[PDB]
Amino acid sequence: MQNFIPNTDGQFHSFRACSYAVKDGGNIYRVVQNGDELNESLLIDTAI
């Protein structure tokens, strides 16, 4: 149940990640990208 938003669709060529959002009378909340804190940007490292 957890995984429903697909992460990619194959080719890194015409992907354009999901663009749904909620509108609340002017105010807008996206779902894939919101610069509000509490969403720790991941520091992944090649060294694995």
Binding site: N34, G35, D36, E37, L38, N39, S41
Partner: protein, 48 residues
Amino acid sequence: DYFSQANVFTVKSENAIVKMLNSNQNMEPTIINWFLFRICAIDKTVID
């Protein structure tokens, strides 16, 4: 004198506009540093 007698505005510390916009680091870094250099301290004796 007449105005400040009614204490319409008292001042709290730690301006929220700089509390937020500080700890989420997911936006263009001039909004920083610029809002960061504009927000001066405030003591009502200037407000009034």
